[PDB]
Amino acid sequence: ELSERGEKLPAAQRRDMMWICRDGDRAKNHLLEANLRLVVSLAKRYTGRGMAFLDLIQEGNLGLIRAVEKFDYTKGYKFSTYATWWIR
DNA sequence: TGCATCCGTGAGTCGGGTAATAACGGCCTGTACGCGTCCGTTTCCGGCACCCCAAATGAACCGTCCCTGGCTCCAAGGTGAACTCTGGGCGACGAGTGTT
Numbered sequence: 001e002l003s004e005r006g007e008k009l010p011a012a013q014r015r016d017m018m019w020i021c022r023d024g025d026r027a028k029n030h031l032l033e034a035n036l037r038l039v040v041s042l043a044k045r046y047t048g049r050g051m052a053f054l055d056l057i058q059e060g061n062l063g064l065i066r067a068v069e070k071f072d073y074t075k076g077y078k079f080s081t082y083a084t085w086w087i088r
Numbered sequence: 089t090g091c092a093t094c095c096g097t098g099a100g101t102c103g104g105g106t107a108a109t110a111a112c113g114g115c116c117t118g119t120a121c122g123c124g125t126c127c128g129t130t131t132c133c134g135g136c137a138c139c140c141c142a143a144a145t146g147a148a149c150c151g152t153c154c155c156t157g158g159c160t161c162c163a164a165g166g167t168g169a170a171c172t173c174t175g176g177g178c179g180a181c182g183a184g185t186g187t188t
Contacts, residue, residue, distance in 0.1 A: 049108055088111085 031068055031079075032061075038080055039064050042087045063087040 002009060009017075039060035046056055067086035071079060 046109090 028068060032064060035064055035068075035079070035083060036061065038083060039087055042084060060087045 040057055043053075043056040043060040047053055063086045064083060067079075067083040070086075071082060
């Protein structure tokens with residue numbers, strides 16, 4: 001929003017925003033690397049037909065990306081239950 | 089600095105075809121198909137303006153392809169006689185033969 005129709009942002013008001021942006025992206029990454037184990041545990045079951053183990057794993061990884069992007073913590077549910085549907 | 093440890097080529101010649109998984113509503117659209125209507129086309133019914141067109145209806149008609157007329161000038165049918173066989177008619181002569 002500040003890019004066009006903004007203000008000459010001072011350093012105190014710019015560096016903090018940049019830092020929190022990087023922090024959020026890093027936290028997202030961290031959750032993904034945490035839950036790849038759930039991804040592989042789910043994808044182990046669909047083997048033996050069509051495509052290979054690693055292809056299934058990477059498709060589950062894409063599904064996990066989608067699940068994290070569309071997750072909602074306010075609902076007070078464990079993340080695994082929501083992510084399983086998207087992985088599948 | 090060997091040294092095991094893979095590691096990369098053989099090794100010839102002309103009956104067919106064999107299987108798995110949670111997935112389920114709900115919205116969009118898109119290309120193909122299915123309705124109703126209108127207009128160019130086109131194609132013929134019968135009309136001329138007449139275009140005339142013509143095979144069919146009167147002549148001659150003249151050469152010619154048929155009739156009738158007379159005339160021969162001859163070669164075939166009718167009129168002879170003989171004759172050389174053609175055939176019958178006449179006659180004599182001779183042995184194989186009916187008989188006591």
